[PDB]
């Protein structure tokens, strides 16, 4: 339920992230792996060692998808149509894991960029990530 | 038992740097604006409609001191957590009826608040120990429920 | 029977009263006074040979009331909710209509099955948990004749369930309570704000909403030619004249996954009885969309009665 | 609408004592005669139910089978006692509820609660501990749990008890009390070169034990070192000159400010009733060694 | 006397009425409908504890 | 009409599956394939089911709609179309991965070691239906490696590395398997072993030196 004032903060806050989005996504992926060990079961062949290239590579594509979603904030389900099918129909990722990644991503943004995370921005960026998780998991069964 | 000695040292170390006066008000103010269904329980604290009023309300800040101190008291001994929070858990279960999830949500917000206040020092292994601490406290305050 | 005390110059003929146990309601035409006769079988004048029946009470919980958030159900104010667990531990709710029958949605019974799976495949695996934790074994799973237009399915239990203080059926209304502004209570067994299935029953009041802005929010327009799929969650709800939409609460609370089959119960203050006005069908809105789709009970009241009779 | 505080006002009118709880349907006896109050709710501030608010005056909505009844604590056969201790003022507490004897859960037990129990039993309350001594875990229904008392009360029944028969706590832990006059308590250091260095050995009512290392530190060590009259504390270890014996009872310390005159004045020190296998015996080496 | 037929989820409050002996008339003002109670002694509301008796 | 046929295989008893339904041909996605399902498939083909493998033999991906996806069979079934399948004509797999069916009479399968000084030690090589092949070393461990040594009668297995002597010819079709208990005698006794259909750039040919070298 992103209000027009809520989307303005999301676009502005994501803009201040800049080119460091790919590294932020990679750090969040690594942060969630060690903090929630059960999450590693969904990555069978990926190397889970700290600083791995695949983790860095995966973080870049995850942040790429989110940055695409911000530019298409009005129409999210179409911009995330391919990812929704892969995450729900192929890998059958449980929806509980998405709230873990969203929390870890917010922590990474808050720690690395503390000055811009006013409480107004925190709520707006939280609602944006909740919208992404629901879209991806809306066809889980 | 629950935590390795190296993990325990870092958790106790960071808790020294904290500003108890302001951290408690910060986390409570964030939960009341991010998840706006907890404003029902805090109607005794006055106006809470707008985020600045939530942050600037003296009552939530004072209640933040109580929440933070109880967290520090819980950190005194982990195995006692069942007995440490038994007195408080009854209040949150029979009088206010606070759902156990809100304990898990407040703890998660606390991790974000601590990360915001500290920065790079919130090393991913450090937050992993903190989440294990938070999960136990949320379970301990909910184990009274039956 | 106990021997009556002896009296001087009198022969005794017996006439006993019949009363149903509490939490049940007596169903008989006569007073229930049963008179002993020469044939030794007790008879009431109006009831004749048939024994009076003790049926369940509708929608009269011992503790009356005042998911993402909501209020914890601590007093057991919703004794008609029943959890249903599928193969993969994908729990789901289900309401209790009659003493032996439950009500849910069709898509709840298609989990891990094909869209045309027969009733015989679904039956062995559905695990109902009505009451506190009382497991119940089912016998039949009836779907709607049009499962593509009304997501409703009836479940028959092997034997009747005792009506305790934590188990009570809620029967169907005689009129329609789906008028905009009618605030109703929804109990849920589904995901919470962390998307993990709730271990405690929660509930929240949701108001009914105008069914034009609900369709325009989902299907783009009320004109069939200009309808386009623009559901903000990526899944199109099943919308037709047998549905009504309920928005969020005051504190921005709604229903996420796993809450299908729950009852949109409204409190009829004049009669002090809880009536089921709608059954949650599209629960995937969570906090992204602004309207949840509920199947109207009145539209399926005729069909439900026919199935129960058989 | 019958309430626990509502039942408290009721039993106060009989002037017998406090009530265990509010009860409904009058399970003990069948009602008789017309009734004047229906769905009665009371705040508890009022001295009597007559000053208490009544939903209806001169009428009753509940039938005689549904009308409530009152079970009172003084009427119940309740009597506190101590079982299996070093003396009659030490051991595991017992509460006789409904004719069945049960223990008290450890959770919520405080020095204030121990002070009330010692006053109730009858032997001096000069020094009170919150642990059971030399006793084994009992069998039965744990009638009391999370007993939170202010301390200045005549009996623990009047004290705010959570619920009769909750039994949530495990039966391994049971609340105990140590009522001492203050003369039997003694502390000594053994197993070292001098009296000021060694392993902390306690002797309460002629029972010898040790001190657990749960919260033992330098700050808590100054209290012991000062108490023995051997200056302050330097090191937590010592050099072994002889072998101390083996003891089974352990003293557990919560926290100390560091300025206390004696170890007995530290708040909430538990004597016995618990085991710390992972932790070792607490040692100390005073500066006057 | 034979037990009254049982009803599912229902309780039967037993009661017996005294019919006056032939050639006699009920002296007591009560009709004589005794009802079984928890104390095993059947009682009519009008006659109370006193048992009905028929006179010529 | 239903008709499942093997194509692009070495023989008629092994090849990539091709299923016609409604009158249109297609291939099955490899996801959900099990050795028991392939055993049921061989019953439809009529080929002997003494040894059955889930691999696809040197066959291309082709071009066609994936009619059946996530087919789950346990073996005691008349045909695989009786087993439950995820949707009909709806798929989300990659087009390259096709379900493979290999039916073996039991005599064609042979195991040999080449490139070493003795017959007991060398690069593991598998010959199935006169098709030359190697073993990818994903699951490869010492305890499954004893089966290869035991099958050849060359005692136990000591180490995976072996001393090169002569070069070995390169092959395209590759075999790999999850794991082996070690209680068995033949490699074919290991269950759910795939024979072709994928390549290993991360992983290389498995080698062994047995004790009887
Ligand atoms: C906002 C949340 C998420 C976003 C934006 C996201 C995005 C992506 C992207 C861009 C890919 C790459 C797909 C490709 O390269 O073809 C991917 C793959 C994947 N996703 Fe996520 N993801 C999210 C959450 C999750 C979570 C929480 C999990 C597991 C707990 C998960 C499981 C996976 C896995 C295992 C892959 C690997 C697929 C492969 O290697 O082929 N996703 N995701
Ligand atoms: C998660 C760990 C929590 C801790 C350690 C904690 C601690 C405390 C403490 C010590 C008090 C006592 C204050 C007093 O007696 O004056 C209190 C009061 C209260 N807490 Fe919590 N709290 C927690 C979570 C929550 C949450 C998430 C809520 C959400 C609404 C909540 C609602 C309340 C309320 C309404 C009161 C007021 C009680 C009253 O007015 O009588 N608590 N809290
Ligand atoms: C407590 O000590 C006494 C002697 O003081 C002893 O008889 C008794 O057995 C002890 N209780 C136990 C070991 O449970
Ligand atoms: C000891 O110090 C504490 C604070 O640590 C203080 O409350 C207490 O009054 C002090 N006692 C004395 C006797 O100075
Ligand atoms: C697979 O091998 C067989 C047998 O040699 C051959 O007939 C067929 O053409 C081969 N297919 C490809 C694609 O090489
Ligand atoms: C497989 O190994 C197990 C022990 O892991 C053994 O009990 C069993 O007999 C073996 N099966 C065979 C040799 O067929
Ligand atoms: Ca305890
Ligand atoms: Ca207490
Ligand atoms: Ca595959
Ligand atoms: Ca299968």
Question: How would you describe this structure to a colleague?
Answer:
Chain A has 141 residues and is mostly helical. Chain A contains 7 helices and no strands. Chain B has 146 residues and is mainly α. Chain B has one domain (1-146): Orthogonal Bundle (Globin-like). Chain B contains 8 helices and no strands. Chain B has helices spanning 5-17, 20-34, 51-56, 58-74, 81-84, 86-95, 100-118, 124-142. Chain B is globular. Chain C contains 3 helices and 17 strands. In chain C, the strands form 4 sheets. A 7-stranded antiparallel β-sheet of chain C has the order 5-13-12-15-16-17-14, with no helix packed on it. In chain C, strand 7 (91-96) and strand 8 (101-104) form a beta hairpin. Chain C is mainly beta. By secondary structure, chain D is of the alpha+beta class. Chain D is 11% helix and 22% strand. In chain D, the strands form 3 sheets. In chain D, strands 8, 9, 10, 11, 12, 13 and 14 form a 7-stranded mixed β-sheet that branches. In chain D, strands 3, 4, 5, 6 and 7 form a 5-stranded antiparallel β-sheet that branches. Chains in contact: A-B, A-C, B-C, B-D, C-E. The interface between A and C is medium-sized, with 22 and 24 residues. The structure holds protoporphyrin IX containing FE (2 copies), 2-acetamido-2-deoxy-beta-D-glucopyranose (4 copies) and calcium ion (4 copies). One 2-acetamido-2-deoxy-beta-D-glucopyranose (NAG) binds at residues 8, 10, 58, 60 of chain F. Chain B: Keywords: Acetylation, Congenital dyserythropoietic anemia, Disease variant, Glycation, Glycoprotein, Heme, Hereditary hemolytic anemia, Hypotensive agent, Iron, Metal-binding, Oxygen transport, Phosphoprotein, Pyruvate, S-nitrosylation, Transport, Vasoactive. Chain B: The modification Phosphothreonine is found at residues 12, 50, 87. Chain B: The modification N6-acetyllysine is found at residues 59, 82, 144.
Spell out which ligands are present: protoporphyrin IX containing FE, 2-acetamido-2-deoxy-beta-D-glucopyranose, calcium ion
- Give a quick account of the main beta sheet of chain A: strands, pairing sense, barrel closure: none
For the termini of chain B, the CA-CA separation is 26 Å
Number of helices of chain A: 7
How many domains of chain B? The number is 1
**Main pleated sheet of chain B:** none
How does the SSE layout of this entry go?
The structure is cut from a larger assembly and holds one copy of chain A (141 residues), one copy of chain B (146 residues), two copies of chain C and two copies of chain D.
Chain A: H1 4-17, H2 21-35, H3 53-71, H4 76-79, H5 81-90, H6 95-112, H7 119-137
Helix pairs in contact in A: 1-7, 2-3, 2-6, 6-7
Chain B: H1 5-17, H2 20-34, H3 51-56, H4 58-74, H5 81-84, H6 86-95, H7 100-118, H8 124-142
Chain C: E1 10-20, E2 24-27, E3 34-35, E4 53-56, E5 71-72, E6 82-85, E7 91-96, E8 101-104, H1 119-122, E9 127-130, E10 138-143, E11 153-157, E12 183-188, E13 202-207, H2 213-219, E14 243-246, E15 263-268, E16 273-282, E17 292-296, H3 301-309
The site of one protoporphyrin IX containing FE (HEM) has 16 residues of chain A, from helix 3, helix 5, helix 6 and helix 7.
Keywords (chain B): Acetylation, Congenital dyserythropoietic anemia, Disease variant, Glycation, Glycoprotein, Heme, Hereditary hemolytic anemia, Hypotensive agent, Iron, Metal-binding, Oxygen transport, Phosphoprotein, Pyruvate, S-nitrosylation, Transport, Vasoactive
GO molecular function (chain B): heme binding; hemoglobin alpha binding; hemoglobin binding; metal ion binding; oxygen binding; oxygen carrier activity
GO cellular component, one term (chain B): blood microparticle
């Amino acid at each position: 339920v992103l209000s027009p004032a809520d989307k303005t903060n999301v676009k502005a806050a994501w803009g201040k992230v800049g080119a460091h989005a790919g590294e932020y996504g990679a750090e969040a992926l690594e942060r969630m792996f060690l903090s929630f060990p059960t999450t590693k079961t969904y990555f069978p062949h990926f190397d889970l060692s700290h600083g791995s290239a695949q983790v860095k590579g995966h973080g870049k594509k995850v942040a790429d998808a989110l940055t695409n979603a911000v530019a298409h904030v009005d129409d999210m389900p179409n911009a995330l149509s391919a990812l929704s099918d892969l995450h729900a129909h192929k890998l059958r990722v449980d929806p509980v894991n998405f709230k873990l990644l969203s929390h870890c991503l917010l922590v990474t943004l808050a720690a690395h960029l503390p000055a811009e995370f006013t409480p107004a921005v925190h709520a707006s960026l939280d609602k944006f990530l909740a919208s992404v998780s629901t879209v991806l998991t809306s066809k889980y069964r | 038992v629950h935590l390795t000695p190296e993990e325990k040292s870092a958790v106790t170390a960071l808790w020294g740097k904290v500003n108890v006066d302001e951290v408690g008000g910060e986390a409570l103010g964030r939960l009341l604006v991010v998840y706006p269904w907890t404003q029902r329980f805090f109607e005794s604290f006055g106006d809470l409609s707008t985020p600045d009023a939530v942050m600037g309300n003296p009552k939530v800040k004072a209640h933040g001191k109580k929440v933070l101190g109880a967290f520090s008291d819980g950190l005194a001994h982990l195995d006692n957590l069942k007995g440490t929070f038994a007195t408080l858990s009854e209040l949150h279960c029979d009088k206010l009826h606070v759902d156990p999830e809100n304990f898990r949500l407040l703890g998660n917000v606390l991790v974000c608040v601590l990360a915001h206040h500290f920065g790079k020092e919130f090393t991913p292994p450090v937050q992993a120990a903190y989440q294990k601490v938070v999960a136990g406290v949320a379970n301990a305050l909910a184990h009274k429920y039956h | 029977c106990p021997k009556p005390p002896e009296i001087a110059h009198g022969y005794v003929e017996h006439s006993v009263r019949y009363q149903c146990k509490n939490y049940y309601k007596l169903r008989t035409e006569g007073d229930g006074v049963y008179t002993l006769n020469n044939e030794k079988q007790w008879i009431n004048k109006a009831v004749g040979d048939k024994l009076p029946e003790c049926e369940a009470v509708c929608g009269k919980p011992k503790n009356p009331a005042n998911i993402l958030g909501g209020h914890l159900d601590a007093k057991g104010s919703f004794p008609w909710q029943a959890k249903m667990v599928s193969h993969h531990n994908l729990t789901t709710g289900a309401t209790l209509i009659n003493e032996q029958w439950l009500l849910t949605t069709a898509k709840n019974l298609f989990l891990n099955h094909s869209e045309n799976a027969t009733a015989k495949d679904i039956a062995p695996t559905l695990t109902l948990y009505v009451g506190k934790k009382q497991l119940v074994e089912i016998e039949k799973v009836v779907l709607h004749p049009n499962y593509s237009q009304v997501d409703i399915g009836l479940i028959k239990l092997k034997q009747k369930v005792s009506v305790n203080e934590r188990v009570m059926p809620i029967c169907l209304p005689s009129k329609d309570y789906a008028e905009v502004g009618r605030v109703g209570y929804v109990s849920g067994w589904g995901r919470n704000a962390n998307f993990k299935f709730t271990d405690h029953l929660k509930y929240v009041m949701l108001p009914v909403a105008d069914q034009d802005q609900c369709i325009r929010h989902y299907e783009g327009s009320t004109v069939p030619e200009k309808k386009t799929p623009k559901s903000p969650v990526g899944v199109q709800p099943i919308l037709n004249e047998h549905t009504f939409c309920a928005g969020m609460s005051k504190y921005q609370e709604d229903t996420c996954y796993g809450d299908a089959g729950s009852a949109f119960a409204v409190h009829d203050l004049e009669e002090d009885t809880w009536y089921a006005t709608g059954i949650l069908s599209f629960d995937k809105s969570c906090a992204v969309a602004e309207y949840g789709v509920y199947v109207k009970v009145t539209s399926i009241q005729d069909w439900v009665q026919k199935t129960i009779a058989e | 609408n019958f309430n626990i505080d509502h039942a408290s006002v009721i039993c106060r009118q009989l002037e017998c004592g406090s009530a265990v709880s509010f009860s409904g349907s009058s399970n003990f006896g069948e009602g008789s005669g017309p009734i004047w109050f229906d769905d009665l709710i009371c705040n508890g501030n009022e001295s009597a139910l007559w000053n208490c608010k009544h939903q209806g005056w001169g009428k009753h909505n509940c039938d005689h089978a549904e009308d409530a009844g009152v079970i009172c604590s003084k009427g119940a056969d309740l009597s506190l006692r101590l079982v299996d201790g070093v003396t009659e003022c030490s051991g595991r507490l017992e509460v006789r509820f409904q004719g069945e004897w049960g223990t008290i859960c450890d959770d919520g037990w405080d020095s204030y609660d121990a002070a009330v129990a010692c006053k109730q039993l009858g032997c001096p309350t000069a020094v009170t501990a919150i642990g059971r001594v030399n006793a084994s875990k009992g069998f039965g229904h744990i009638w009391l749990d999370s007993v939170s008392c202010q301390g200045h009360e005549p009996a623990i029944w009047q004290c705010k008890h959570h619920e009769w028969g909750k039994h949530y706590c495990n039966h391994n832990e049971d609340a105990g009390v140590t009522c001492s006059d203050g003369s039997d308590l003694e502390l000594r250091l053994r197993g070292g070169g001098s009296r000021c260095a060694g392993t902390v050995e306690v002797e309460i009512q002629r029972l010898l034990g040790k001190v657990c290392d749960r919260g033992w530190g330098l700050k808590e060590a100054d209290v012991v070192c000062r108490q023995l009259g051997c200056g302050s504390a330097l090191k937590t270890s010592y050099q072994v000159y002889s072998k101390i014996q083996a003891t089974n009872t352990w003293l557990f310390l919560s926290s100390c400010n560091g300025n206390e005159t004696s170890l007995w004045d530290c708040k909430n020190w538990q004597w016995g009733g618990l085991t710390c296998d992972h932790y070792e015996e607490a040692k100390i080496t005073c500066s006057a060694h």
